[PDB]
């Protein structure tokens, strides 16, 4: 018959860290275990990777049962990067795929036209300055050049160059490129040269700022932003990598998270399964890449690390949870509260 009170019962309760508490069969003791939840395993490969700093196993594991094609492209990237190394990866990803002289003055000749005459005057009259002018106001550019190309003056020797750019710049791509080089700038190339010739832009950026990593990285990032905005996703990560901009890459990967989490959902996964697999793959991908760059301030990124933390502590692995918590700003009372809980829990 039913009774109001005192019946035996396991009175089980879940506790922090993935612990299950219950009263023992005899009913006078207590049991505290860490139950097996199918699909809920402790991430030992990441713990290993993070400690050894060897991501080969982790990279390979992901490389096997990878999801969409873009994600495959990403992991493959990390595979190579992990092999050749950050420097070698960049060198290979940015890499590319006398004459006739005999003039003999012959016969008689004469100066015809007020032009060919006044200039000749200017010359012998030892007045190279005006000679250049008259050559230019007239359409005798090679003449002006050959002359200035024989003087050691600069202001003049460059008045000719500006004249050249002034009328040919817009009529020739080579001319337009020479311009930036002559003016020692790349702004025009980074912003307007065909995104297909990006490796040229890059190399240009490199050869103009060899002693200025800040300017170089800024340009390299400008070019990267552009590549991305033009559908060249993979080449944008390469430029970003070369500039040590983990933020840019992080943002790209964050914006793509929702869609990724949706493809897993369609793969007949529950909300939990989808969220969990998506998050883990995102964090592993980030951690690995974060290892080969030169860098957590992003607002959304912190919230996800905090989501990864909870999925981690529920596997009981307070060691991994601690690792990630320490990489977050202690100025965040969320991160602050979390650290404390884990600390006390594992300590």
């Amino acid at each position: 018959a039913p009774t109001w009170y005192g019946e035996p019962s396991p009175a089980a309760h879940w506790a922090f860290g993935g612990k299950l508490v219950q009263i023992t069969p005899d009913g006078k003791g207590v049991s505290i275990t860490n139950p097996k939840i199918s699909g809920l395993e402790s991430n030992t490969t990441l713990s290993e990777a993070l400690k050894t700093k060897d991501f080969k196993p982790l990279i390979n594991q992901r490389l096997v049962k990878v999801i969409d094609d873009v994600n495959e492209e990403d992991w493959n990237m990390l595979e190579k990067l992990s092999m050749d190394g950050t420097e070698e990866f960049l060198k290979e990803a940015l890499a590319f795929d006398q004459i006739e002289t005999n003039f003999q003055p012959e016969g008689d000749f004469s100066l015809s036209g007020n032009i060919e005459q006044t200039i000749s005057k200017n010359l012998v009259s030892g007045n190279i300055k005006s000679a250049v002018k008259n050559s230019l106001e007239n359409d005798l550019m090679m003449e002006a050049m050959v002359i200035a190309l024989d003087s050691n003056n600069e202001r003049l020797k460059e008045s000719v160059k500006n004249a050249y750019f002034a009328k040919y710049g817009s009529k020739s791509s080579l001319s337009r490129i020479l311009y930036s080089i002559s003016k020692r700038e790349v702004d025009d190339l980074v912003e307007n040269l065909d995104v297909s010739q990006w490796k040229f832009i890059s190399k240009a950026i490199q050869n103009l700022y060899p002693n200025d990593i800040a300017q170089r990285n800024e340009m390299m990032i400008k070019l990267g932003d552009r590549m991305k905005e033009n559908g060249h996703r993979q080449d944008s990560l390469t430029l970003y990598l070369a500039a040590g901009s983990l933020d840019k890459v992080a943002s790209i990967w964050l914006s793509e998270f929702p869609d990724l989490e949706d493809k897993l959902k369609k793969d007949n996964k529950t909300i939990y399964e989808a969220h969990s697999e998506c998050m883990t793959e995102f964090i592993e991908r980030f951690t690995v890449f974060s290892n080969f760059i030169n860098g957590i301030n992003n607002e959304q990124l912190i919230a996800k690390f905090l989501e990864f933390i909870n999925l981690t502590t529920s596997t009981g692995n307070f060691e991994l949870a601690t690792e990630f918590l320490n990489s977050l700003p202690s100025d965040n009372e969320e991160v602050k509260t979390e650290k404390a809980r884990v600390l006390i829990a594992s300590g």
Binding site: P10, V21, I37, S314
Partner: protein, 288 residues
Amino acid sequence: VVIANAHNEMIHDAVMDYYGKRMATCSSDKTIKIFEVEGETHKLIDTLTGHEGPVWRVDWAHPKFGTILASCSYDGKVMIWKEENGRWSQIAVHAVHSASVNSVQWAPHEYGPMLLVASSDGKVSVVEFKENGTTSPIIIDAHAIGVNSASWAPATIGTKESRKFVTGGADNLVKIWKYNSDAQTYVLESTLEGHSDWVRDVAWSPTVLLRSYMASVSQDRTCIIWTQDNEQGPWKKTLLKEEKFPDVLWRASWSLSGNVLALSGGDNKVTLWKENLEGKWEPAGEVH
């Protein structure tokens, strides 16, 4: 890990603290014993005396209020204990019930240190602590015959009207209460029929995702999982499994994450369950 012979009489509840490091146990011997559990090692800290009959349940307050524990017992009282410098002492007592008190649960912390209390007198009492120390309680007639359990819903994600909690009684009903400013108390939101015998426990899931989940467990050997998608909408009844369990079910408990349920029955068994795509429930770890 195991802590053998914690008590001489039967133990009725064992709850770890917010850190999963400290643990309290209560028994028919009328005491509460506090333990500190490390790895596979433990240490009895103290034994709490004061109750005059079996102690049914205990709960831990959030750490931000200090190291505090609440207990309830057959004697009809709820007692509050505190640890100040490795030593424990009764710091308060709540005794507004004319019968056994079956459950006590600290409210979500955002609400301050609040206590939800269920008694066999048919009433539920909500208790907070004044600045001075004493307590001012809210009392409501919640179920005919008796109340056996009352669990808090998660804090909405500081408005007081959004506070809800679920009760379960010996009248077979599962009820939902919401705080109402005007009435100055908790009022009936819904009545959930679906059990043919006494509801022994109710637990609201803390899960933070669209649907809300609650579990009722009964003497009729069933576990119902209630779900709600709309704030003011109806709750859907979903049997944990189509057939009755071997024996009575006494408690249900949700995991902090993953939304995994842990059931406790008369055959002294504990089953774990999770929800699949078909929106149905299945074992969460190697069935037995």
